[PDB]
Amino acid sequence: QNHTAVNTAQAIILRDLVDALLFEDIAGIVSNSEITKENGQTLLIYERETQQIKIPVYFSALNMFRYESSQPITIEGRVSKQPLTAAEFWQTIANMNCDLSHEWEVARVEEGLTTAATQLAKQLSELDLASHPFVMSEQFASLKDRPFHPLAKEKRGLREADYQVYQAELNQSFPLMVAAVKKTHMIHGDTANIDELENLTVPIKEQATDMLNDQGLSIDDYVLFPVHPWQYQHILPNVFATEISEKLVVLLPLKFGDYLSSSSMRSLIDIGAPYNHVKVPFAMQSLGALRLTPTRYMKNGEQAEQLLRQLIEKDEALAKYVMVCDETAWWSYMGQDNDIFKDQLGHLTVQLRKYPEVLAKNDTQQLVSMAALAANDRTLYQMICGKDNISKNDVMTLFEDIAQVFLKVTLSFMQYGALPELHGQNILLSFEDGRVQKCVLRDHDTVRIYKPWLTAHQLSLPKYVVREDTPNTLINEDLETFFAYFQTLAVSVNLYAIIDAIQDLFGVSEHELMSLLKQILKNEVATISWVTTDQLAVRHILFDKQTWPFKQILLPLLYQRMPSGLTTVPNPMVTY
């Protein structure tokens, strides 16, 4: 057992837990503590019931307190000289708030923190970096996962053997499996060519044909769907119990191909075609939510991808930098009722993601997800810069370049009333000679829209399949809500996680990196032709307003038996 990897992994889950508690002010850890200073070190004194915690803190570039992770936390009465685990600190906080703990899921958060530390230790210990740079960058994005989130590495439903095979970090390949779906009971994308799906499963077509013939069924009546081996074993026999009885779905115990997981365990990589990914259902619980893409989201992603391509034609900045993944080739089960809203449909789908050909025929450019750059590891920075000897001025110049192209592209989209979900996992940067050449968008199912701006530019609204006269996350009814998903995902999570990584790796101040980010944002907002009636509101929300919205990730996990939530935190752009 690698004891260095266990201690390193335990310290990462503790740091993410304490920071996540401080950002959301869980049990008044900030608001009901006193700021003091013992021997040049700022401390939160959290006193409650009869216990006391001393947290070493520093005022971060988000204008909130963060855990000074170099210094140890002091719990009054704890005589143990060993490092604090995240599970122990959580248990201490829960026992200090007996009134609150009642209505929280204390038991499984404690278990999830233990799992997160165990599985991350495994992945640090047995990290096997792939030879292909894009596959390798996806391993680092998977290793880091959702930043400032202590339960990110917990994958509920996965047994210990499932972690070993499906986690991208360990570099183990696995086959796909087959389910015959009757042609009468399925739909597909408007421009989805069946030839491409047939090409996927063609090696086992003859074996599948024989298996159906030993059952009184004909392959001419069915379409062969790839199924994830976990989805195949644990989910499909139950969710399609009646459909399997009626011979509408047939689970063929076939195995074909050789697939690695990406940053997502749903989007799979064939090493023979590493820019042609296969997305399949994997009904497990990541970040407290059941990882399930409903069939209507793929129909929405088709309408969204269509809008994104119109803005790339229209805008000068988007034409230069932005490319998008083709996700139009998708197939899904469809019950005889023709109710696309049914949750069942999401468990039996297949979606082909074609990355731009320009990249796949360029072996010199390195495709790196912005999630991968948040990983506390030199590998990707040394590859991009082209040297081990990375100076302070090198990485600052590199961050300025990433922040300039990202914030220009993001705000250039937003002026028209369109906002892709731009956390680190959905956007990739094409690096060449240490500079950002291109941005590559993927997962287009959550492109948010502001109708008044789309109407002002005379753009057709995406024909989103949504519940009739009911509010949803896709259509934002005011500018505060529209800019919230930029302020949270793009700046406070994505860009700040890259700042957090660069500080850990190269010792550059996060304050100097935030000043660099702040100035780029001011330059972009000033030079974009906003709808003139709303220009003052854009400036107010970002720069002048005393609060920013913050996406809640811990408090939902305490409430779930998955609630959505924004709360107010201080404006990082404000100096006060």
Least Å distance, CB 369 to ligand AMP, is 8
- The type of residue at 453 is W
Cα–Cα distance list, 220 to 3, 44, 121, 214, 565 (Å): 56, 69, 49, 15, 48
Taking CB under 6 A as the binding criterion, the range among 85-93, 129-137, 263-271, 355-363 that sits at the site for ligand AMP is 263-271
Q: Give the CA count within 13 Å in the CB-facing half-sphere of 413.
A: 28
Least Å distance, CB 370 to ligand AMP, is 8
C-alpha–C-alpha distance, residues 22 and 65, integer Å: 7
Judged by beta carbon, residue 86 or residue 93, the one nearer ligand AMP is: 86
* Ramachandran angles phi, psi of 203, nearest 5°: -60, -30
Taking CB under 6 A as the binding criterion, the range among 41-49, 422-430, 469-477, 479-487 that sits at the site for ligand AMP is 422-430
Decide if 158 contacts 288 (C-beta within 8 A): no
Judged by beta carbon, residue 21 or residue 371, the one nearer ligand AMP is: 371
Render 355-372 in DSSP notation, one character per residue.
--HHHHT-SSSEEEETTG
Decide if 75 contacts 92 (C-beta within 8 A): yes
158: left (phi over 0), alpha (psi -120 to 50) or beta: beta
Taking CB under 6 A as the binding criterion, the range among 45-53, 218-226, 230-238, 418-426 that sits at the site for ligand AMP is 418-426
Judged by beta carbon, residue 263 or residue 415, the one nearer ligand AMP is: 263
Judged by beta carbon, residue 371 or residue 491, the one nearer ligand AMP is: 371
Judged by beta carbon, residue 346 or residue 424, the one nearer ligand AMP is: 424
HEC sequence for 386-411: CCCCCCHHHHHHHHHHHHHHHHHHHH
Beta bridge partners of 549: 568
Judged by beta carbon, residue 54 or residue 153, the one nearer ligand AMP is: 153
The answer to whether 286 contacts ligand AMP (rule: CB under 6 A) is yes
Judged by beta carbon, residue 286 or residue 332, the one nearer ligand AMP is: 286
Q: Quick one: which of 66, 122, 146, 188 contacts ligand AMP (CB under 6 A)?
A: 146
Judged by beta carbon, residue 54 or residue 66, the one nearer ligand AMP is: 66
Kindly identify the residues of this chain, within the stretch 266-285, that bind ligand AMP according to CB under 6 A.
266-267
The answer to whether 554 contacts ligand AMP (rule: CB under 6 A) is no
Judged by beta carbon, residue 43 or residue 554, the one nearer ligand AMP is: 554
The answer to whether 424 contacts ligand AMP (rule: CB under 6 A) is yes
From the list 267, 263, 232, 265, the residue with the least C-alpha distance to 163 is 265
Determine the size of the site formed for ligand AMP (CB under 6 A): 14
Q: Quick one: which of 16, 19, 24, 145 contacts ligand AMP (CB under 6 A)?
A: 145
Least Å distance, CB 233 to ligand AMP, is 19
Kindly identify the residues of this chain, within the stretch 291-310, that bind ligand AMP according to CB under 6 A.
291
From the list 495, 492, 474, 491, the residue with the least C-alpha distance to 418 is 474
Judged by beta carbon, residue 208 or residue 372, the one nearer ligand AMP is: 372
C-alpha–C-alpha distance, residues 59 and 42, integer Å: 9
Judged by beta carbon, residue 24 or residue 145, the one nearer ligand AMP is: 145
Taking CB under 6 A as the binding criterion, the range among 44-52, 259-267, 360-368, 380-388 that sits at the site for ligand AMP is 259-267
C-alpha–C-alpha distance, residues 546 and 524, integer Å: 21
The answer to whether 263 contacts ligand AMP (rule: CB under 6 A) is yes
The answer to whether 353 contacts ligand AMP (rule: CB under 6 A) is no
Q: Quick one: which of 328, 425, 552, 571 contacts ligand AMP (CB under 6 A)?
A: 425
Decide if 327 contacts 447 (C-beta within 8 A): no
Reading the block at residue 313, the tokens are: 């034609």
C-alpha–C-alpha distance, residues 400 and 499, integer Å: 11
Cβ neighbors of 258 (< 8 A, separation 6 or more) are 173, 174, 175, 270, 271
Judged by beta carbon, residue 46 or residue 166, the one nearer ligand AMP is: 166
Binding mask 436-455 for ligand AMP (x = CB under 6 A): --------------------
The answer to whether 264 contacts ligand AMP (rule: CB under 6 A) is yes
C-alpha–C-alpha distance, residues 18 and 74, integer Å: 13
From the list 57, 66, 51, 20, the residue with the least C-alpha distance to 36 is 57
Q: Quick one: which of 423, 438, 448, 518 contacts ligand AMP (CB under 6 A)?
A: 423
Judged by beta carbon, residue 289 or residue 461, the one nearer ligand AMP is: 289
- The type of residue at 391 is S
C-alpha–C-alpha distance, residues 442 and 428, integer Å: 8
Residues present in the chain in total: 576
DSSP H or E segment with residue 57: strand 51-59
Least Å distance, CB 74 to ligand AMP, is 32
Least Å distance, CB 429 to ligand AMP, is 14
Taking CB under 6 A as the binding criterion, the range among 60-68, 258-266, 390-398, 528-536 that sits at the site for ligand AMP is 258-266
Judged by beta carbon, residue 291 or residue 299, the one nearer ligand AMP is: 291
SS3 state at 541: helix
C-alpha–C-alpha distance, residues 264 and 245, integer Å: 32
The answer to whether 138 contacts ligand AMP (rule: CB under 6 A) is no
Judged by beta carbon, residue 264 or residue 410, the one nearer ligand AMP is: 264
Decide if 265 contacts 212 (C-beta within 8 A): no
Question: After which residue numbers is the chain interrupted with C–N beyond 2.5 angstroms?
Answer: 561
Taking CB under 6 A as the binding criterion, the range among 1-9, 417-425, 472-480, 539-547 that sits at the site for ligand AMP is 417-425
The answer to whether 371 contacts ligand AMP (rule: CB under 6 A) is yes
The answer to whether 154 contacts ligand AMP (rule: CB under 6 A) is no
Q: Would you call 565 exposed, middle or buried from its count of C-beta atoms within 10 A (0-12, 13-18, 19+)?
A: middle
C-alpha–C-alpha distance, residues 504 and 438, integer Å: 26
Taking CB under 6 A as the binding criterion, the range among 38-46, 51-59, 349-357, 420-428 that sits at the site for ligand AMP is 420-428
Decide if 30 contacts 145 (C-beta within 8 A): no
The answer to whether 493 contacts ligand AMP (rule: CB under 6 A) is yes
The answer to whether 167 contacts ligand AMP (rule: CB under 6 A) is no
Where along the sequence are the contacts to ligand AMP (CB under 6 A)? 145-146, 152, 263-264, 266-267, 286, 291, 371, 423-425, 493
